[PDB]
């Protein structure tokens, strides 16, 4: 049940962020990528915007260039889909995540 997978990751990534935890991040980030990947395919953007947001926070601090690069690509697809539904809030939401990700 994807909806729960996000629910666990939003808990886990928050504990990782606060706990500055470098290698719990690695596997949690990899799970996040795929959960985010599944959320894109099924057009569930509100989970995708929340999940990617905190995931980017963990990615930058831990400095996983692989995850950052993968997140650079997902953020671009995510933005595109959001624009096509004309959801300005979600676009502002995605772009602010893009800004911190784009150059840190």
């Amino acid at each position: 049940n994807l909806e729960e997978e996000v629910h666990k990751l939003l808990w886990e990534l928050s504990e990782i962020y606060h706990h500055h935890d470098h290698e719990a991040s690695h596997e949690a980030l990899r799970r996040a990528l795929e959960v985010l990947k599944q959320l894109l395919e099924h057009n569930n953007l509100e989970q995708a915007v929340t999940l990617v947001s905190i995931a980017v926070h963990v990615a930058v601090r831990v400095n996983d260039e692989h995850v950052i690069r993968e997140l650079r690509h997902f953020l671009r697809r995510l933005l595109k889909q959001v624009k096509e539904h004309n959801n300005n809030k979600l676009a502002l939401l995605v772009m602010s995540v893009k800004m911190q990700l784009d150059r840190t």
């Binding site: 606060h18 926070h57 809030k89 602010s96 911190q100």
Partner: protein
């Protein structure tokens, strides 16, 4: 998560705008990160960002342009040094970082007008 802010705000004769941004904090959270984005016209920039503990003053990263105070589930942000060019929609993004889980909420934005 719902975030509320005034529809329109006018900068004083000395471009200092003040507006309150209220977030429906699930119960009570500890680490809150507030980000102010400016949208004008289709251009999106990050005006300021601060991580603060729910009831304290706001420790800003830029430590410029923006000052803020927090009281419960709401924060009063004060932006200085505004010129007419800086007129635009100032939107509040609020994140609950700790304790888990993470939450995210965006307002619909405050139209600030500078003379």
């Amino acid at each position: 998560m719902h975030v509320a802010q005034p529809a329109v705000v006018l900068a004083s004769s000395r471009g200092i705008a003040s507006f309150v941004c209220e977030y429906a904090s699930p119960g009570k959270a500890t680490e809150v990160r507030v980000t102010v984005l400016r949208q004008a016209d289709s251009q999106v920039t990050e005006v300021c960002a601060a991580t603060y503990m729910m009831g304290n003053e706001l420790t800003f990263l830029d430590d410029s342009i923006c000052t803020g105070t927090s009281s419960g589930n709401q924060v009063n942000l004060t932006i200085q040094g505004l010129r007419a060019m800086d007129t635009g929609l100032y939107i509040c993004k609020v994140e609950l970082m700790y304790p888990p889980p993470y939450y995210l909420g965006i307002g619909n934005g405050t139209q600030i007008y500078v003379i």
